[PDB]
Design an enzyme around this catalytic site. Structure first.
Site: not given
Ligand SMILES: Cc1ncc(C[n+]2csc(CCOP(=O)(O)OP(=O)(O)O)c2C)c(N)n1
Ligand SMILES: Cc1ncc(C[n+]2csc(CCOP(=O)(O)OP(=O)(O)O)c2C)c(N)n1
Ligand SMILES: Cc1ncc(C[n+]2csc(CCOP(=O)(O)OP(=O)(O)O)c2C)c(N)n1
Ligand SMILES: [Mg+2]
Ligand SMILES: [Mg+2]
Ligand SMILES: [Mg+2]
Lengths: 554, 554, 554
Positions: A28, A49, A418
């Site tokens: 695309h 991404e 956070g």
């Molecule tokens: C989340 C996401 N969906 C779709 C695309 C676009 N896209 C179409 S096919 C493909 C990748 C194929 O790679 P792989 O997982 O190795 O399968 P293959 O075609 O190599 O068998 C991508 C990146 C994208 N960039 N990101």
């Molecule tokens: C995306 C996300 N998921 C869950 C939480 C909740 N949460 C607060 S701290 C934490 C994890 C900390 O673990 P780590 O990266 O091992 O650091 P540590 O505190 O062990 O040093 C979680 C799960 C968050 N803040 N963000």
């Protein structure tokens, strides 16, 4: 002389001064890839991404400029949403470019079409819009850039349908505009400035606090002249910290957090000048624990809503933070009759040193490496030639206790969102910016958090980016485990342990250098050896879980 | 007597019959974790909220029941958005439970608060709402469940503030309702059914096509009786395929895709009965390549919008697909005077076999393993005791050519969203469901796609889930590389190669069994050995990039 | 062979069977006006877009068919929003067609452009979308119509840019589809129907309650056969009332409200069959005052969310209400062995009559005309040849006490939105529909409410629509004044008096017949004289303010 919509996008980006993009390929958006290849503009392609989006953030934050992210229709867009939200609360300038389904064959149940991408992004962007005609591409790209870069900075979404991009037009029939937008921010009315300066002159214990908007414009030589003429000590939140690195030592207060113990010492600030720092998480909300209820507050922010949102203030100014700093330096060069303040600066210095020494006298490494001791090892490598990126909860709370007495080139930590995991991508983007500036990037993350994006070790090797990733490994989601023990009961732990997996082994399988250490001596040798090589690396550090950092009690 | 809001949630889930949840811990939602621990309801905790979300999908799709996901405030919610969008376009029933900032101290710039989570989910859910009082928890949880489970199935979001959850009330003062909702779907008016059956009786080349709503209700014994009495051959899209596994071989048409070559053979269908299959990507849009412009169409769907959206139809019925199948079986047991159709079924059979043999005569493995030959090796292990999950573009397009002649217990592939990476989490969820049914799960994914969630190998080992992960490794994002060569030029490839990294080494570092193979003989031995062990595994398969699958021409 | 986008719209509307539109002209939508003029399809043009929208509602509600509203870009759309919201909560089928700014010259700060009209309507429509190509007009108009007409009925928004409408294409290159959608709704599984009928057969005091979905499909002969075979008494909310007009007198329960006093009389219903009636405002929420907590409830609704939302139920069925009534009649024609129920019907009858006589013995008209006495005068003209429309708070609460013992052709009152002013436009649209059926329309409204749309007297005269507007004049916003006295204090009235203006004088200045009356005798003569003339009229009725209607105590 016939050209594609993808060409139009890239020609406009060039004219705006952009030199790097961050993304993941899709059919695309292939016209944008081909145009970059023709013009020698590199695209850093990741393994997710989300990582691409956080990399645009990191590039912007470390280089004080615009970041640009590039994703495809459907899942390409939805995988970018966490970066968008993070940039929104952090006030960071990123242009998100996304593909979408063709306008012809709208509403036909086809591949990757059908989700209202603009509606999803509306609540978390400064602006979000879908392009309706190929001719409009240059003017709308430039408009999106102007929105992101003005005060307060933030993310923007431009949605470009696969129809509109593949379309071909006569290059002579549509003009590419310049970026015409002043580099200088607006400044306060001279009467408000006089009032601010008269208050500052008659204060007994004045203090300054910086926030993110100070970092975005980076008016260092002006900030330096102002501080040197008035002798007033300066503090910052995480995002403002690196703006203190060029100040004389006697006026370096450090992070706002250590304003905590001032009250119990009869030293509560008299007056506080807030420059882009909001009332919220980093400043102690409306509690008065850091910014006292008894102090007079002068607040400067580009958004009127923030002016005294949780607390009464004395003077509220809407203006640009950089422009204000600049105006304070100018008034203060004519003026030059300022009271001493030597005793008060010594008091600020002594209080910060007291906190540090108190922590140190309580930390032991017999039978297990203490988190504070591990932080200390990193600190001796931190200076103007280094960017530090922090992730992972308990990890960054301990790390912050050593960050005030050093002078980093950059410091990038969690904001209000956070969210565990954003560190890896952020650090990758920062390293791309640091290479042109001649600096090294170091990420300090938790064993939980590193798992979110562990695939990016592959990207580091493919692109030859010499980032060092340090993992503080306490066999668990740490802070959350502490909550269960402290708030519920000693035997109420579930879903928080992570007693499996060799993280250094994973990096090695992707082709990066892997180390494992468990003491002051071994960690010290491994880090020194990693800095000596121009290559990416992973250092896996065994660290104790039990100790409780001072900030966790708050 | 006094109980928490979290207790109320869990007591309501139990009364609804839920036995498993999928999530990642946070302090905001800890009351739900504690309640599950007291009641012996397991929570499967992953390494990323996206993987948790897709696991709920996988459990729902493979078990024909409700899926439940559990995430924390802020980034917990934003990490879940790709799963929500995927379930929306696939019509799959998942209850998303999310935390959010406390209602008291609203609008105070605090940790993880401030994003309008309900506004973000509105465009991609059947219903989305934020709970305002602890007393409302039971009736609103049950209301959300009813919305998810009715025709057409889809995702729902319930937002529960950290106020509302920690709050304590008298258990005697709020009642927990039953789930009272009929298990039988609504059925057509007898006059419409009569008209449909009269058209079917006088057709010369009739055909049936099944979609997702047939799998959600799984009316297998009714479908069997109807097909046995009329002798009409049956086709399906990806999601409907496993509904063909219990039919006699002479009436198994396979995937809709191989209806393609019927026209050039003078065998274009006369009449087509569409049961929950929409006009869209899987059915050839409005082009008439699969569903002919000259055929008479009977369409049955619970959403009136879909009825002939891209093409003229003869009869349009809004009803439940399961209820309709059930009504067709009942009318057809009284009836029992149906024309032969032996010749027509043989024709359908012969055409499918012709396609297969044509592919086989063109595939060579001298100097590199052909993707078709690799698919064939998997196919000899596929039957009623196996669920197959498919990810990764070129990989699934080749794999589909072998799927029609076998009879899988389950088959889970991309829908309209078409997003690389969703496979790993989906397969994990499916394996949890397969264990109670006594079946094995196999994921077939690409080398690009596996990187999105490679950390889940850790979860497999921690939870002892014996999933087999097979990686088709062509050193690239394959389909996208093909696009650049085919649509732009042979020397126009950028951002699409992935020539680095040992994926089997990564799995080994997480504690799972790792294999690397590169031929028919070695792959065959490795897969047989993995099936013989009750343990998770990764098989890394070197495969050629150059061959173009038939579907990629379309 | 070249035609405009406006032609395409109108050709599609004709093929769908529409015969009338309601709107207000703008240059942006002129192509639709020209096409209607060529094809002899009338547009009823009003003095306010809000009145046009409510007229589309009234036409739909009184004629049991689709309504169509037509408005221009910008303020044309925003003036239509109250109608959209009202139709959303009332489940009424209206297609809203709106103009918008041209796609070329998007984002140029031009006349009537710039508001995101689709985003505004999303929370209050079944579907809302903006057309991207002229070629798509026929398929998308027809898709919008299918969404509005299916269960449960509701409003839809189609946004047509001024670009897309003026565009010309070859008529031979785009096909206009038929409306192919079954006229029969889906019906319950035979096992659920058997269970429902076995419960009904063994009940001692069963009752039926109808809601809006029964009026939309109008299955009168089926309803009649079912009631005649079982002898079960029937009640309704406001919107269902007219569906009782063809039933024998002994089974007419009236409005649900008078189920109130059954409990204190030892006659609380045993079992209640709810057909499209929701738990909410009209049915006494979850309080059990009308639908007893001790009764067994069978609920039938097309939306699973409504099934027992505020109260425990015994059996929950998702199906079409018309289809269900039809299925109940069919099973009950084979069956024919039903218990007597003569005593129970006499009890229902006696309780309603007791309420009426109690009200009557308390109402006096010495020195001022009592609201109840005024309602009685209207009642003696109400039968199958009349549609009654009700607005204005205290006015409709008094009027409802006389509505149960008469048999109206139509009855249109406030729903959940409860918004003063919607009556005038609603009545105007109903009269357009009533003309083809040979019926008279009568609006009964308050002195406050009539002011919202008083300009429509001009439209009545211009179009020669013989609507009779009766104003109950108590010199105030009545119900709100009562609230201040009853809830705050006798001397706490502000902003609620309206002691000025001659409403009959205003109608006369617009060219309509005006009367003023103040007693039983004068009002009686004026209404009879107005019905005798084929012309619009206004009757201004002086009425007392002090009396409190029974329903206001609740
Ligand atoms: C989340 C996401 N969906 C779709 C695309 C676009 N896209 C179409 S096919 C493909 C990748 C194929 O790679 P792989 O997982 O190795 O399968 P293959 O075609 O190599 O068998 C991508 C990146 C994208 N960039 N990101
Ligand atoms: C995306 C996300 N998921 C869950 C939480 C909740 N949460 C607060 S701290 C934490 C994890 C900390 O673990 P780590 O990266 O091992 O650091 P540590 O505190 O062990 O040093 C979680 C799960 C968050 N803040 N963000
Ligand atoms: C659009 C709108 N505005 C205001 C209200 C609040 N309100 C409830 S009753 C009422 C007014 C009643 O006035 P009138 O039409 O004279 O009827 P009466 O009560 O005097 O019979 C008002 C203003 C409302 N429901 N809708
Ligand atoms: Mg940890
Ligand atoms: Mg590949
Ligand atoms: Mg009044």
């Amino acid at each position: 002389a016939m050209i594609t919509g993808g060409e139009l996008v890239v020609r406009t980006l060039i004219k705006a001064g952009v030199e790097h993009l961050f993304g993941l390929h899709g059919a695309h958006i292939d016209t944008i890839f081909q145009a970059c290849l023709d013009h020698d503009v590199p695209i850093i392609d990741t393994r997710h991404e989300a990582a691409a989006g956080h990399a645009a953030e990191g590039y912007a934050r470390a280089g004080a400029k615009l970041g640009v992210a590039l994703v495809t229709a459907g899942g390409g867009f939805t995988n970018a949403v966490t970066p968008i939200a993070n940039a929104w609360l952090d006030r960071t300038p990123v242009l998100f470019l996304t593909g979408s389904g063709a306008l012809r064959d709208d509403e036909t149940n086809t591949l990757q079409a059908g989700i209202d991408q603009v509606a999803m992004a509306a609540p978390i962007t400064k602006w979000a819009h879908r392009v309706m005609a190929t001719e409009h591409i240059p003017r709308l790209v430039m408009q999106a850039i102007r929105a992101a870069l003005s005060a307060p900075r933030g993310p923007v979404l431009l949605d470009l349908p696969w129809d509109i991009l593949m379309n071909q037009i006569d290059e002579d029939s549509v003009i590419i505009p310049d970026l015409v937008l002043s580099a200088h921010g607006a400044r306060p009315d001279p009467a408000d400035l006089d009032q601010a300066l008269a208050l500052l002159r008659k204060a007994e214990r004045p203090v300054i606090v910086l926030g993110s908007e100070a970092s975005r414009t980076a008016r260092k030589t002006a900030l330096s002249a102002f501080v040197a003429a008035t002798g007033v000590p300066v503090f910052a939140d995480y995002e403002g910290l690196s703006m203190l690195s060029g100040l004389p030592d006697a006026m370096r207060g450090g992070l706002v957090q250590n304003l905590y113990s001032f009250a119990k010492a009869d030293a509560a600030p008299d007056l506080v000048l807030m420059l882009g720092a909001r009332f919220g998480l980093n400043t102690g909300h409306g509690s008065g624990q850091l910014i006292p209820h008894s102090a007079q507050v002068i607040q400067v922010d580009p958004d009127a809503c923030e002016l005294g949102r949780l607390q009464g203030i004395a003077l509220g100014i809407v203006a640009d933070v950089g422009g204000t700093i600049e105006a304070l330096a100018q008034a203060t060069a004519q003026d030059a009759a300022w009271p001493d303040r030597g005793d008060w600066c010594a008091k600020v210095t002594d209080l910060a040193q007291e906190r540090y020494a108190s922590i140190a006298a309580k930390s032991s490494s017999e039978h297990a490496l203490h988190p504070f001791h591990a932080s200390q090892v990193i600190a001796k490598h931190v200076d103007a030639g280094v960017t530090v990126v922090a992730d992972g909860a308990l990890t960054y709370l301990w790390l912050s206790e050593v960050m005030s007495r050093v002078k980093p080139g950059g410091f990038l930590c969690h904001g209000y969102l956070g969210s565990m995991g954003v560190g890896f991508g952020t650090a990758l983007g920062a390293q791309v910016a640091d290479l042109e500036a001649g600096r090294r990037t170091i990420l300090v993350t938790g064993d939980g958090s590193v798992g979110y994006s562990i695939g990016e070790f592959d990207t580091l090797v493919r692109k030859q980016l010499p980032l060092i990733v340090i993992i503080m490994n306490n066999q668990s989601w740490g802070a959350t485990l502490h909550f269960q023990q402290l708030a519920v009961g000693p035997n109420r732990v579930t879903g928080t342990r992570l007693e499996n997996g060799s993280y250094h082994g994973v990096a090695a399988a992707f082709g990066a250098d892997g180390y494992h250490v468990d003491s002051v001596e071994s960690f010290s040798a491994a880090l020194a050896q990693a800095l000596a090589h121009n290559r990416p690396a992973c250092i896996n550090v065994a660290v104790a879980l039990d100790p409780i950092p001072p900030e966790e009690l708050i």
